[PDB]
């Protein structure tokens with residue numbers, strides 16, 4: 001008897017499914033129900049591996065399942081082809097970005113097609129094409145008109161490797177999101193920002209309902225960081241003015257022993273005593289000579305000048321000195337702060353140096369703070385020496401003080417967020433050009449909507465587009481030299497481009513109307529497919545793409561183009577696929593493993609010595625090598641950098657697509673990480689071989705049998721099989737809906753065993769034929785090629801036309 005052979009049959013069914021267009025999505029979902037199944041589109045910066053395929057196979061499983069149930073399914077694929085990812089990869093190998101991108105796209109398509117993944121390719125989008133980015137420019141103009149896009153000068157994050165500024169979200173642990181080994185630096189530049197802080201409250205509040213993993217919600221809440229602050233008024237002794245001071249710690253008001261004004265604050269010179277005017281003016285002048293960076297410095301000695309003026313602390317009614325000092329920036333709050341040395345380390349050091357009072361008003365839980373205080377206590381505690389507030393917990397105390405201040409007209413509550421506006425401009429060539437013009441007379445002028453797109457100059461010299469500090473477009477007068485759309489005189493086009501995350505913040509909407517050349521998309525089409533019912537992608541995008549996208553959707557909603565305010569109704573973050581990786585030789589002596597420098601560095605750990613227990617605990621193992629030594633192996637995230645990627649092409653050629661699909665889907669719960677292993681591959685083979693063998697063994701008998709029968713007339717093992725069949729259907733259906741793919745496969749393995757057990761006692765019967773029929777249908781989402789192959793041995797149409805088996809509730813009773 002022949003055995004399962006993946007060769008040839010997979011290519012046959014892949015072409016069949018494509019020709020039939022089973023996964024083509026309707027422009028507008030017929031009244032039967034729709035399912036928008038989306039996977040995060042890839043950066044075409046390299047070859048796809050089984051890691052990417054876990055994410056994309058998960059999407060295909062759900063898409064096939066929903067399509068079989070009768071839903072109109074939108075399951076699209078596209079290319080996040082602009083920005084740093086694509087250009088950094090192309091430039092590393094001295095290749096032109098446009099050539100590199102399309103060659104990579106061609107390869108990615110093959111990898112997806114070879115795995116039996118089906119998308120509605122008619123909705124494909126490539127962000128680096130004018131047909132797409134012209135709409136990025138369109139949206140940019142709308143934000144400009146609505147006060148959400150602006151130009152400002154200030155300190156920004158910069159990566160010397162990318163040779164461009166980076167947004168706050170693109171800085172991970174002080175390192176570049178692309179160059180994890182390169183520390184980000186600071187610079188002073190005038191850039192473009194998107195006022196995402198204008199939606200901070202809605203971004204925070206709208207998280208509550210969301211069917212997203214709590215871990216992602218928590219990361220976004222922490223990133224936004226809503227804070228309870230206050231503006232407090234301090235009356236100046238003998239003067240009319242009451243100095244407004246902003247603080248994030250109103251709970252420490254009773255401990256404010258002095259005020260500090262930024263050198264540039266108008267009141268610094270105005271309030272200076274006559275005898276102090278000379279020293280104050282000199283200090284203010286010296287401060288201005290410094291650069292933003294210089295004053296934004298860290299370890300510089302504390303300096304300052306007493307203005308010779310006093311203010312009254314509104315809470316204690318006590319007199320406190322007013323000083324001006326370099327460590328206070330005018331841009332922070334109101335440019336004036338209340339110093340609380342006991343609870344602010346910066347204030348502590350200044351107080352200690354200039355002999356200013358230090359008063360404790362927040363007590364530390366457990367062991368009380370010592371006297372004298374050797375350093376500030378900045379954590380929450382219990383209010384003390386704070387009049388009627390004594391005994392109140394710090395956090396709640398903030399609210400109480402604010403309520404008191406407002407009631408007495410001494411100040412007002414002021415909410416702030418840690419979230420900062422989004423820096424979108426980049427000094428790179430491969431990106432969307434900013435649709436703005438700089439006129440010497442008019443200032444910054446927007447490009448007319450009708451003139452879009454503002455095409456990227458076709459630079460062919462690779463050495464030319466390479467980033468050296470300024471935007472490559474700054475060396476092309478043929479591009480920027482233009483006329484002002486307002487006055488008509490000579491002007492200069494903006495030379496910076498939009499970061500890649502701009503493109504990806506709305507691509508899922510373009511999929512609903514990929515060919516519209518008048519609007520980014522037609523509201524009617526988008527509102528029919530939105531919101532995304534199930535989005536699948538990595539958690540690494542928690543405060544990047546997953547945050548920016550919500551902002552874009554809320555903005556487009558406010559424009560009246562999108563009905564929903566949340567783009568992804570359901571989000572599932574898949575665990576990473578890992579691969580056993582050799583980190584190098586080690587030496588063992590007793591319970592201690594010595595790690596030579598090369599090995600330690602590859603492992604990226606500080607230990608030069610690990611115990612055998614440490615090695616086990618981190619999931620590593622020591623394997624004898626032919627070089628006569630022992631090497632330390634450990635599962636590492638599958639990626640190019642690690643050089644441990646398992647590519648689709650070579651694997652499916654030697655093994656097969658369904659084998660790879662089962663290996664991935666059965667390894668572990670999809671939300672968890674998994675390790676790609678030979679044992680897993682062998683397991684996939686065993687399962688597929690066992691399915692084929694069961695059907696082949698009964699092929700002849702099945703052909704001469706009808707699948708019609710009366711359930712209530714079944715007896716013995718026949719009735720038992722009928723019950724197990726429906727128990728299995730229910731389990732597999734519910735598991736698929738919750739993306740519990742590995743357990744759905746376990747249920748099919750279990751039911752397959754039941755089929756073998758059944759046949760030991762019973763012959764091929766009508767109920768058995770129906771069980772086989774239902775089995776191939778339930779198998780289709782997981783191993784489609786084999787399911788389609790066996791299905792055709794007995795039935796005419798495709799599994800996509802068979803629908804999803806109907807559950808028999810009564811069969812579940814008892």
Ligand SMILES: CC(C)C[C@H](N)C(=O)NS(=O)(=O)OC[C@H]1O[C@@H](n2cnc3c(N)ncnc32)[C@H](O)[C@@H]1O
Nearest residue numbers: 040041042043051052080504537538545576577638
């Ligand atoms: C939505 C946009 C911003 C996504 C962005 N283009 C992106 O993250 N692209 S990517 O790096 O090509 O990744 C695409 C998806 O594949 C997932 N992925 C990569 N490597 C993986 C491993 N080893 N295991 C599991 N999943 C992996 C990644 O998380 C993205 O979801």
Ligand SMILES: [Zn+2]
Nearest residue numbers: 159162176179
């Ligand atoms: Zn970088």
Ligand SMILES: [Zn+2]
Nearest residue numbers: 439442484487
């Ligand atoms: Zn002008």
